[PDB]
Amino acid sequence: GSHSMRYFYTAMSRPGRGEPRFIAVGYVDDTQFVRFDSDAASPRMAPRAPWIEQEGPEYWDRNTQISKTNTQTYRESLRNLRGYYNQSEAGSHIIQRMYGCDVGPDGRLLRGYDQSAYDGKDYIALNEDLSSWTAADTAAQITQRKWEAAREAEQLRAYLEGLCVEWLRRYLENGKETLQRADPPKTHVTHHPISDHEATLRCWALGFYPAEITLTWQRDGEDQTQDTELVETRPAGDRTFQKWAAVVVPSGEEQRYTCHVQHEGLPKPLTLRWEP
């Protein structure tokens, strides 16, 4: 189907505790494949997926040099944004940036992304046209004016339409046995009595990849959105994910409830009920 590549940058100041830390991780879909950490004894871009290990020294050296440059640029940037908000030297702050590309089943660019946050709130984002900016406040307008003057948008668009799509295509082919393989969820329904009046039906999904999934409870065929407790999708540690959906039902009405599971690893969506 469709695929994404994303890089996630986190730069965090820590006054009195040395210079700001810079961390970068790269993903294809829900698979991490590289990391860089400026706190490492010897910082380098390092492999985190087997199919990236075959890349040559020029690849690793280029990704490492850029990340080391980014460490300094993000330290300077944290200083700049502290000034923009008239903030004290004593506080710790965070710049976050996520950028990347989505491509379709034919590898054609669907859209590009470049968004930045400051202390967890939207700061500046490249617009979907890959040509204009959305600044959250007058501080980000200062960044916007710097970036217009350096023609950053052209350089980000060039990357997003160029290297991003071409390297995503290369990774998808080199890692095709995992990245282009959808593992369906293993499902079951558990029954946990609450009292003599009520019980919890919990619908389980295990071992699935990618993370995207929809689990819903119906009572007499009507979605129980308001009454369903959804747990956040969680990683198993082996590339796969887990999730469950729960609903509190009247004792003796269990067969009126059905769990519905949609996932791209499944030929057809699933309807499940409690099997006592």
Partner: peptide, 9 residues
């Protein structure tokens, strides 16, 4: 592969 290092904020 990462994007070339860009301008400071």
């Amino acid at each position: 592969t990462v994007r070339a290092s860009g301008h400071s904020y």
